[PDB]
Design a protein around this motif. Structure first.
Motif, mmCIF file in Angstrom:
data_model
loop_
_atom_site.group_PDB
_atom_site.id
_atom_site.type_symbol
_atom_site.label_atom_id
_atom_site.label_comp_id
_atom_site.label_asym_id
_atom_site.label_seq_id
_atom_site.Cartn_x
_atom_site.Cartn_y
_atom_site.Cartn_z
ATOM 1 N N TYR A 1 1.550 8.264 -6.629
ATOM 2 C CA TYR A 1 1.515 6.811 -6.511
ATOM 3 C C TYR A 1 2.903 6.218 -6.698
ATOM 4 O O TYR A 1 3.279 5.264 -5.992
ATOM 5 N N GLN A 2 3.689 6.815 -7.612
ATOM 6 C CA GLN A 2 5.087 6.419 -7.789
ATOM 7 C C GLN A 2 5.885 6.583 -6.501
ATOM 8 O O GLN A 2 6.674 5.703 -6.142
ATOM 9 N N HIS B 1 -0.811 10.217 -10.121
ATOM 10 C CA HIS B 1 0.038 9.154 -10.647
ATOM 11 C C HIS B 1 1.456 9.261 -10.101
ATOM 12 O O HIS B 1 2.038 8.261 -9.657
ATOM 13 N N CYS C 1 -1.294 2.364 2.332
ATOM 14 C CA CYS C 1 -2.008 1.552 1.354
ATOM 15 C C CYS C 1 -3.360 2.168 1.008
ATOM 16 O O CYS C 1 -3.812 2.073 -0.138
ATOM 17 N N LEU C 2 -4.006 2.822 1.983
ATOM 18 C CA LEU C 2 -5.263 3.523 1.717
ATOM 19 C C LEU C 2 -5.067 4.689 0.757
ATOM 20 O O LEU C 2 -5.877 4.894 -0.157
ATOM 21 N N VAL D 1 -2.704 -3.624 -3.116
ATOM 22 C CA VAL D 1 -3.810 -3.925 -2.218
ATOM 23 C C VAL D 1 -4.830 -2.790 -2.307
ATOM 24 O O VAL D 1 -4.473 -1.628 -2.520
ATOM 25 N N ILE E 1 -5.140 4.835 -7.017
ATOM 26 C CA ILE E 1 -5.650 3.860 -7.983
ATOM 27 C C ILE E 1 -7.042 4.264 -8.440
ATOM 28 O O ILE E 1 -7.354 4.251 -9.645
ATOM 29 N N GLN E 2 -7.880 4.666 -7.475
ATOM 30 C CA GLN E 2 -9.235 5.114 -7.764
ATOM 31 C C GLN E 2 -9.224 6.299 -8.711
ATOM 32 O O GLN E 2 -9.770 6.210 -9.812
ATOM 33 N N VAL F 1 -7.694 -0.747 -0.132
ATOM 34 C CA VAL F 1 -8.141 -0.472 1.227
ATOM 35 C C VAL F 1 -9.405 0.366 1.144
ATOM 36 O O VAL F 1 -9.431 1.397 0.467
ATOM 37 N N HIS G 1 6.101 2.139 -11.574
ATOM 38 C CA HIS G 1 4.770 2.105 -10.987
ATOM 39 C C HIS G 1 3.692 2.601 -11.942
ATOM 40 O O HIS G 1 2.515 2.355 -11.684
ATOM 41 N N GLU H 1 -9.238 8.266 -15.884
ATOM 42 C CA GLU H 1 -8.867 7.498 -17.059
ATOM 43 C C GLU H 1 -10.094 7.138 -17.878
ATOM 44 O O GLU H 1 -10.084 7.254 -19.106
ATOM 45 N N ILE I 1 -15.922 1.186 -9.462
ATOM 46 C CA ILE I 1 -15.028 2.190 -10.028
ATOM 47 C C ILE I 1 -13.884 1.508 -10.766
ATOM 48 O O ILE I 1 -13.496 1.913 -11.868
ATOM 49 N N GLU J 1 4.257 4.120 -3.326
ATOM 50 C CA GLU J 1 4.580 2.695 -3.250
ATOM 51 C C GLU J 1 5.993 2.482 -2.707
ATOM 52 O O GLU J 1 6.263 1.492 -2.010
ATOM 53 N N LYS J 2 6.897 3.425 -2.983
ATOM 54 C CA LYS J 2 8.204 3.416 -2.333
ATOM 55 C C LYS J 2 8.061 3.616 -0.828
ATOM 56 O O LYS J 2 8.771 2.987 -0.033
ATOM 57 N N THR K 1 -4.534 3.292 -2.624
ATOM 58 C CA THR K 1 -5.815 2.858 -3.167
ATOM 59 C C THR K 1 -6.618 4.034 -3.705
ATOM 60 O O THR K 1 -7.263 3.927 -4.756
ATOM 61 N N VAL L 1 0.444 0.457 -12.088
ATOM 62 C CA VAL L 1 -0.924 0.947 -11.962
ATOM 63 C C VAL L 1 -1.743 0.581 -13.199
ATOM 64 O O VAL L 1 -2.923 0.216 -13.089
ATOM 65 N N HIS M 1 -4.976 -1.942 -13.133
ATOM 66 C CA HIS M 1 -6.228 -1.531 -13.764
ATOM 67 C C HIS M 1 -6.681 -2.550 -14.807
ATOM 68 O O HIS M 1 -7.857 -2.936 -14.845
ATOM 69 N N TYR N 1 -6.957 7.535 -10.678
ATOM 70 C CA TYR N 1 -6.511 7.227 -12.029
ATOM 71 C C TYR N 1 -7.618 6.497 -12.791
ATOM 72 O O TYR N 1 -7.838 6.780 -13.969
ATOM 73 N N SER N 2 -8.380 5.618 -12.125
ATOM 74 C CA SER N 2 -9.463 4.937 -12.844
ATOM 75 C C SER N 2 -10.587 5.896 -13.251
ATOM 76 O O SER N 2 -11.066 5.838 -14.394
ATOM 77 N N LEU N 3 -11.000 6.793 -12.340
ATOM 78 C CA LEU N 3 -12.051 7.763 -12.667
ATOM 79 C C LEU N 3 -11.631 8.692 -13.798
ATOM 80 O O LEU N 3 -12.351 8.828 -14.798
#
Lengths: 108, 1581
Positions: free
Chosen positions: B294-295, B291, B314-315, A77, B321-322, A79, A3, B328, A104, B298-299, B318, A7, A11, B324-326
């Motif tokens: 997140y591992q 991170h 899923c929220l 996905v 994901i957010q 959300v 994962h 990162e 973002i 997803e499981k 998400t 991820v 990205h 990690y983007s900020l």
């Protein structure tokens, strides 16, 4: 350890788009009210080969404020959600959260 | 890898023996262990006065399933035990008189005492379980109030208590001190500190304790926007109103409305965790944590069945994901080229992390253990340290690992619980390499799990329990050690916390018995280090190894930790403190007992001396002196080893390598000669039912012609056997020929030509590619034909001999038709002759027999078949040959056997169905070539001169010409052994599986889950307090804490966040200065003997000494220095299966060479009977040949050294060396039975193990006939001296030669091998009344007398055999592990013979498999439990008692039984060792309580061990699974076990060369292997 690759792949995938609507989103101060947020989100849904799924809540708050959520059907996905005084306003702030989640996500 | 050993959990046992004591430990297993040990150790004192031993507890009566202590003590030690279920009527019949331990509720004990059923004087020991409870205090308060305290101390029992670990009881410090006072006044005991914590804090030094403050985080853009993101997701999730009524609305699913989980609680956990990680550690830590979340999430997406749960998960994903983007982008916004990211890493690190990093910077042998009370905190701390170690050049020198306290639930998912354990295993094995440093643990490493010395211990979390703080302190062993707690103004409350725990430490160590020396006593030792002479066993060596005062305690600890034993037994020295007051000076005096495994068992007493440390150094110096005096230490002062020891030197002759040793060796890779008549008398003819040939029976003695033996060497006397030919059963005997005839030369030439014609053309043994000469010094065997006289005599038949001389080339040729015109006919000529068909294949002719004379048969008769009309037409068409006369009748012929081996004196007629009547090498071929039956013509069949009856006598006897060369080597072996002997003369399964799994798991119920109960009550519970009052003692610690506060705020602890004559005079102030100046002289260093002389002067000048009993030293120092307290602390038989049948010594010839030639037969040939019939007795005799010798010669040396002696002397390399010395391999035959190739009448490569398999096989030759005894003399012939050797001169007895006599020496020394000495008792009488103890200890052994069925003479060997290696309270004998050492070879030999001598006559491979399947240590434990050896055994070692309690629970809820144990045997072709091994040890006792008499052992053991061995005999382990294990050059390889989907079934693969792969399923590995072999046999027929 899969994962981590997932991820990073997501990205890079949602930084790999070539849409000018994303650039218009990025440069504009998104706290503005002039932009048609739900319609633009549907436009990007048609653009990037997925479904934006607006789903309302069945349960209003203790303060009596409506809640909507938006499913960004990517892999994985996204959300997002909003809470507004009307279902229109809840969907508006939910589509808003979808767009700053993309902003973002799309910041290179 | 060294440390300082103590007797932890055993100081508790000692202090539990003298004084009333209360013990504080954590597990409930160690409480039950110490409780059981103390009940059995006081049981002997209870049983003599007939007292009642009581265990009081409150977790009794909760289940009709037996309580743990009742289980432990009913079926694991000596005692018959009763537990009261809560609603029985409490029977008063024999529950305390004829039952030792009663585990009772305290109200049950109240009912027992207030009804006057039991007297308190008849109460020996009471142990009170969990007395730290206030409620347990409430029950035990009237028990002490009414009964215990009103009893006088003359009438009191011994009071012990068990408590939760009061160093972290659920109490503020005033309740703690009030609790310690109240319990120590109420229970009449002394509180005891000693746990493993207290052990590693007492004799490993304390670290430097720091609190280090950490600066707060300075928030910025990225941190605040992350806080905005998480608070956004949190506000939306708390803004949810969740209701399954408003979502599902299912009235019919009331069970499922609550079974469906909340979609919020795992989002709550993930988002709260990321909030806290930002709030303290930072946004980089939040990034790596997010991170990893997140591992896992997803499981959780994959796992999720429902809909809103999937939405919210899923929220959460998400949001990750957010984040990690900020992070990162904001960590890659600094990532330009030429920029180091470490400044931004440390910047976004909080100063908690930066303060951790400067703490780690201060350590440029690092060993750092870092706690944290959260698992993903350990993962992120791991990830920070990994990123630092891979980037920072300052901190590049670390190798970091981690772990977790999240062993998964095995009731659902145990497969990755195995991977959890594997992960912990691999981490720890990398850790202890001395090549890896840094660990980041969790609370899994808190208690139970042991980790080496680790100097820097950093606690992340402030401690909320004492145990984690002090055990983190204890994991810092190596001084200088740094115990650093990090904190980020709660510094006030943390300083208050360390003050609370500091007074808890100083209320721990003051409440000990044993004490550490303080720094003052360390300084006194450092001062006095040079004033005493350095004791050296070699004082002449300048650079020799030395033992001063200082290193002597280390060397005695090393001596106690280098003697090898089990990992469940802990062996350590035992010093005690004795205070003696002389001449106004206090003197401390240490005695020093070494444990019972070491043979220095007399106490060593020290000399009086002013301090603790100096006296302890002197007492350990004394121990080193006397231990080198005995020899338990070597010249180089290290302790003895199994390979560093050599026995007495003429026994070491067997361990010098051979010239052939200097394909690895030793591994698996005119003369009146003797004349006799060969009488072949038919006793039983073949039955006509078994006459498948359908012919006449031809007896061998119906003729009057026979044979005889004429030899220059002596022919022995043998019992009559029977040759089973086709004609039936023929008894063969040797009639004594009354005439001895002088040789005649030309008649010998007649004999030799006859033998050439016979063994070339009649019996045809002498094939070509050959040389032979029947005239030599080595054997002169002449087999001659004689004719029976009408008067009964057997005169020599020279007539047939000269006839065969003139006609030794009787060869049918191309007979002309004219001679067959002239050929006549007569019935008498073919009456008993051999018929010869000449007309085809003349070069290799076949000889046929006469069966019946038929007048109705003719060549003119009809051919039986429509192919031809007559025999004339058939022969003339098929061959073109003309028969002259057809008027004569024809002949019925019989075909010869195609196999020489028809004699085999026990069975050939029963073996005749094996192979189709000599297998027809030619008969089936000729009956195929001739189709119709062989009805032959007398004209075409000429006469062979050898008669038919004489031929049938000839085929019974032959192929002896190599056997004569064979049965000379055996008689030669007999000759040398009687030469050097004295003896002898020179002239469903699936239902079973589910039931056993259910019974096993749900009836163990006290597995390693008890350590998990300790784990789940470890940091969490830490409870129970009694009261507090407002007494000033509380106010006393209210300054003490305060002043400790000042100590914490004055030690530099908290860190801001920005004359040798005077030496001797102080050594001896109670010894006058003048005598010291006298003894000084030129000698600058006084020896220990000088201080002994001073003490001897002083006790001669006052004889009245005082004594003192205190401390961790035991009352088990006992008799040899105490128990009289006299101030002397200065210096010192069925004949059936009889093993002792023993036929008479002089008057028996010795070894009959038949069974020697059996033992001279390799199984590579495997000619019927092989050496492997007796080899398996040889090894299992030779152990009991050597070991008893190697027990009685070195009667007081610890047994593991003797084990190395056994393992080098009963080596197959060792027996191969011995047989090299004796050269039996050429005397033994390893060639096939081929007359053509490898048959040489007047080289066989041998494996090295087979030579060993040779040598011990010869032992069997002497081993029935002489009894057991004389083979030892053969062993004395063999060069392994197993008898005590009496050297003498020429006695010259005239009645007989003495047994054990040897050859005369060149200096006429006569060596007599007398039998083993009737042994000394091991009762080493250092004590005056050691016999009174020898009968004190063994109360209850009359049941051990009757159940075993043997009565001992002297109980010395029994109470050696009842002594564990860690059983130090007994001081008469040694441990039982010397009667292991002899008991194994004795029961090995006895059971191996009863396997061999069985009437069913098991096979050689069956003999090996019945050794390794009839008996192992498991059936020793099983029949031990069946004969109650659990209920009779003595042991004082930890861990072993809970392990063997689980094992005897396996025997309990099954009820002894054979089923589980022979099942595990069936996987065995183990949970304990000790309780198995006791059945060997008592066996060794009945070896030498009964004076080396194996018959005593066997008749005692038969009526107890019968139904097991008839069951394993009736189970029949005699399958061709062993030939499938062999027949394998490359053709039967077995793969690894491969676990299937359900886990409880394994598939075993077998690959078969050029035939394929087969696989078998099973309930484990072994039954799967059996099913795979069965499938391979079923598909490989």
């Amino acid at each position: 350890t899969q994962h981590s690759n997932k991820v990073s792949q997501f990205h890079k995938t949602l930084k790999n788009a070539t849409g000018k609507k994303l650039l218009k989103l990025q440069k504009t101060c998104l706290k503005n009210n002039k932009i048609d947020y739900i319609k633009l989100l549907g436009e990007i849904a048609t653009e990037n080969q997925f479904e934006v799924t607006y789903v309302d809540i069945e349960e209003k708050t203790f303060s009596g404020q409506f809640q909507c959520l938006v499913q960004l059907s990517t892999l994985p996905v996204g959300v997002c959600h909003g809470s507004g005084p009307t279902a229109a306003d809840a969907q508006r702030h939910a589509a808003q959260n979808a767009l700053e989640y993309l902003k973002i996500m799309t910041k290179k | 890898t060294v440390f300082t050993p103590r007797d932890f959990q055993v100081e508790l046992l000692a202090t539990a023996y003298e004084r009333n004591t209360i013990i504080c430990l954590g597990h409930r297993s160690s409480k039950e262990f110490i409780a059981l040990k103390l009940l059995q150790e006081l049981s002997r004192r209870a049983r003599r006065h007939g007292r009642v031993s009581v265990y009081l507890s409150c977790e009794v009566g909760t289940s009709t399933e037996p309580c743990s202590i009742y289980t432990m003590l009913t079926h694991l030690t000596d005692l018959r035990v009763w537990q009261e279920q809560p609603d029985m009527q409490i029977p008063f019949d024999h529950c305390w008189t004829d039952y030792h331990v009663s585990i009772l509720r305290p109200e049950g004990f109240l009912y027992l005492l207030e009804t006057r059923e039991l007297l308190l004087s008849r109460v020996e020991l009471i142990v009170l379980e969990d007395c730290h409870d206030s409620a347990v205090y409430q029950r035990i308060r009237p028990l002490f109030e009414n009964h215990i305290m009103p009893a006088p101390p003359a009438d009191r029992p011994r009071i012990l208590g068990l408590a939760g670990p009061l160093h972290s009881a659920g109490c503020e410090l005033q309740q703690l001190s009030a609790m310690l006072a109240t319990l120590e006044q109420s229970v009449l005991c002394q509180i005891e500190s000693a746990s493993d914590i207290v052990t590693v804090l007492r004799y490993c030094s304390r670290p430097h304790e720091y609190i280090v403050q950490c600066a707060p985080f300075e928030m910025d853009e990225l941190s605040l926007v992350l806080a905005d993101v998480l608070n956004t997701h949190k506000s939306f999730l708390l803004d949810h109103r969740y209701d399954p009524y408003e979502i599902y609305g299912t009235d019919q699913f009331m069970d499922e409305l609550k079974d469906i989980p909340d979609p919020k609680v795992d989002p709550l956990n993930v988002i709260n965790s990321l909030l806290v990680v930002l709030h303290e550690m930072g946004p980089w830590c939040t990034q790596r944590a997010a991170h990893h979340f997140y591992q896992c999430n997803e499981k959780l997406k994959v796992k999720t069945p429902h809909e809103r749960h999937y939405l919210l998960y899923c929220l959460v994903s998400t949001a990750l994901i957010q984040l990690y983007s900020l992070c990162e982008h904001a960590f890659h916004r600094h990532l330009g080229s030429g920029s180091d990211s470490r400044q931004t890493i440390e910047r976004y690190s909080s100063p908690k992390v930066r303060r951790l990093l400067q703490t780690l910077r201060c350590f440029k042998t690092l060993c750092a253990l870092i706690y944290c009370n959260q698992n993903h905190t350990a993962r992120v701390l791991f990830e920070l340290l990994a990123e630092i170690s891979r980037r920072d050049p300052d901190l590049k020198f670390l190798r970091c690992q981690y772990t977790t306290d999240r062993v998964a639930d095995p009731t659902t998912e145990p497969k990755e619980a195995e991977l959890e354990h594997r992960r912990q295993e691999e981490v720890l094995k990398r850790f202890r390499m001395h090549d890896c440093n840094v660990l980041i643990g969790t609370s899994v490493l808190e208690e139970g799990i042991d980790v080496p010395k680790c100097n820097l211990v950093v606690r992340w979390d402030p401690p909320t329990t004492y145990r984690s703080y002090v055990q983190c302190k204890g994991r810092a062993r190596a001084a200088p050690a740094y115990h650093v707690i990090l904190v980020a103004s709660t510094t006030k409350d943390l300083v208050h916390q360390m003050a609370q725990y500091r007074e808890i430490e100083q209320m721990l160590l003051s409440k000990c018995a044993n004490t550490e020396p303080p720094e003052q006593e360390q300084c006194e030792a450092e001062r006095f280090s040079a004033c005493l002479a350095a004791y050296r066993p070699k004082p002449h060596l300048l650079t020799g190894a030395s033992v001063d005062l200082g290193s002597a305690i280390a060397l005695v600890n090393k001596y106690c930790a280098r003697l090898p034993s089990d990992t469940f037994t802990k062996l350590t020295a035992l010093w005690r403190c004795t205070r003696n007051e002389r001449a106004g000076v206090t003197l401390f005096q240490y005695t020093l007992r070494l444990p019972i495994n070491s043979p220095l068992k007399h106490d060593i007493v020290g000399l009086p001396m002013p301090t603790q440390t100096l006296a302890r150094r002197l007492a350990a110096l004394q121990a080193c002196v006397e231990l080198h005096r005995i020899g338990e230490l070597d010249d180089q002062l290290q302790p003895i080893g199994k390979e560093g020891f050599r026995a007495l030197e003429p026994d070491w002759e067997c361990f010098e390598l051979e010239p052939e040793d200097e394909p690895r060796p030793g591994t698996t890779k005119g003369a009146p000669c003797y004349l006799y008549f060969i009488q072949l008398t038919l006793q039983c003819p073949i039955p006509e039912e078994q006459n498948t040939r359908g012919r006449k029976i031809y007896p061998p003695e119906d003729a009057q012609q026979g044979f005889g033996i004429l030899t220059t060497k002596r022919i022995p006397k043998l019992s009559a056997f029977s040759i089973f030919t086709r004609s039936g059963e023929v008894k063969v005997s040797l009639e004594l020929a009354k005439e001895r005839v002088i040789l005649t030369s030309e008649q010998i030439v007649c004999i030799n030509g006859f033998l050439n014609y016979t063994f070339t053309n009649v019996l045809r043994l002498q094939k070509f590619l050959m040389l032979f000469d029947p005239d030599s010094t080595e054997n002169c065997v002449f087999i001659v034909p004689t004719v029976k006289a009408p008067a009964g005599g057997k005169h020599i038949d020279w007539q047939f001999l000269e006839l065969i001389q003139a006609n030794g080339n009787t060869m049918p040729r191309a007979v002309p038709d004219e001679e067959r015109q002239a050929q006549p006919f007569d019935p008498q000529r073919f009456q008993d002759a051999v018929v010869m068909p000449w007309y085809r294949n003349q070069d290799q002719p076949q000889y046929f027999y006469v069966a019946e004379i038929c007048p109705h048969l003719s060549p003119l008769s009809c051919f039986p078949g429509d192919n031809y009309r007559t025999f004339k037409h058939y022969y003339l068409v098929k061959y073109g040959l003309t028969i002259q006369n057809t008027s004569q009748p024809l002949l019925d012929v019989d075909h010869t056997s195609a196999r020489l081996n028809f004699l085999t004196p026990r069975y050939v007629n029963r073996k005749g169905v094996a192979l189709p009547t000599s297998s027809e090498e030619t008969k089936r071929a000729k009956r195929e070539n001739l189709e119709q039956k062989q009805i032959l013509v007398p004209e075409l069949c000429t006469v062979h001169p050898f008669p038919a009856s004489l031929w049938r006598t000839a085929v019974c006897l032959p192929c002896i010409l190599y056997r004569i060369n064979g049965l000379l080597l055996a008689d030669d072996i007999r000759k040398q052994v009687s030469a050097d002997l004295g003896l002898g003369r020179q002239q469903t399964a699936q239902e079973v599986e589910k039931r056993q799994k259910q019974l096993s798991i749900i009836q163990a119920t006290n597995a390693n889950e008890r350590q998990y109960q300790q784990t789940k009550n470890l940091l969490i519970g830490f409870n129970f307090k009694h009261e507090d009052q407002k007494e000033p003692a509380t106010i006393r610690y209210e300054e003490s804490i305060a002043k400790l506060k000042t100590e914490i705020e004055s030690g530099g602890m908290l860190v801001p966040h920005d004359s040798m004559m005077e030496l001797l005079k102080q050594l001896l102030p109670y010894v006058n200065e003048d005598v010291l100046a006298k003894k000084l002289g030129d000698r600058r260093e006084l020896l220990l003997s000088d201080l002994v002389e001073l003490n001897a002067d002083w006790v001669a000048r006052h004889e009245q000494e005082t004594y003192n009993v205190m401390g961790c030293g035991d009352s088990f120092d006992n008799y040899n220095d105490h128990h009289r307290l006299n101030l002397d602390e200065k210096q010192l038989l069925p004949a059936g299966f009889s093993f002792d049948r023993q036929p008479d010594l002089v008057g028996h010839p010795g070894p009959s060479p038949s069974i020697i030639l059996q033992a001279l037969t390799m199984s590579n040939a495997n000619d019927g009977i092989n050496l492997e019939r007796l080899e398996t007795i040889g090894d299992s005799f030779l152990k009991y040949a050597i070991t008893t010798y190697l027990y009685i010669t070195y009667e007081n040396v610890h047994e593991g050294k003797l084990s190395h002696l056994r393992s080098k002397q009963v080596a197959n390399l060792n027996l191969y060396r011995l047989g090299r010395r004796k050269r039996l391999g050429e005397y033994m035959i390893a060639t096939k039975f081929e007359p053509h190739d490898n048959w040489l009448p007047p080289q066989h490569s041998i494996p090295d193990k087979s030579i060993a398999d040779c040598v011990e096989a010869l032992i069997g030759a002497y081993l029935i006939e002489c009894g057991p005894r004389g083979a030892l003399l053969f062993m004395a012939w063999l060069g392994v001296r197993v008898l005590p050797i009496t050297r003498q001169l020429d006695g010259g007895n005239q009645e007989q030669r003495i047994p054990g006599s040897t050859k005369p020496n060149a200096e006429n020394v006569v060596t007599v091998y007398g039998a083993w000495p009737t042994p000394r008792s091991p009762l080493l009488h250092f004590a005056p009344n050691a016999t009174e103890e020898l009968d004190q200890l063994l109360s209850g052994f009359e049941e051990f007398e009757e159940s075993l069925g043997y009565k001992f003479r002297d109980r010395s060997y029994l109470l050696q055999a009842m002594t564990h290696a860690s059983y130090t309270p007994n001081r008469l004998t040694d441990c039982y592990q010397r009667l292991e050492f002899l008991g194994d070879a004795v029961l090995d030999y006895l059971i191996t013979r009863h396997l061999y001598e069985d009437p069913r006559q098991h096979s050689p491979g069956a003999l090996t498999d019945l050794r390794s399947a009839l008996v192992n240590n498991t059936i020793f434990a099983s029949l031990a439990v069946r004969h109650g050896f659990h209920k009779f055994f003595r042991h004082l070692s930890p861990g072993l008692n809970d392990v063997i309690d689980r094992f005897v629970r396996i025997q309990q809820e099954n009820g002894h039984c054979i089923s589980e144990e022979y099942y595990l045997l069936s996987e065995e072709e183990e949970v304990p060792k000790a309780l198995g091994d006791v059945f060997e040890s008592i066996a060794g006792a009945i070896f030498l309580d009964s004076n080396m008499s194996l018959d005593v052992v066997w008749h005692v053991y038969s009526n107890m061990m019968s139904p097991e061995i008839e069951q394993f005999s009736n189970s029949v382990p005699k399958s061709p699974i062993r030939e499938l294990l062999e027949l394998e050059p490359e053709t039967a390889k077995f793969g690894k076990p491969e676990k299937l989907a359900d886990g409880r079934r394994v598939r075993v693969t077998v690959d078969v060369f050029c035939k394929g792969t087969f696989r078998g399923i099973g309930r484990n590995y072994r039954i799967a292997k059996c099913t795979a072999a069965k499938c391979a046999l079923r598909q490989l027929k």
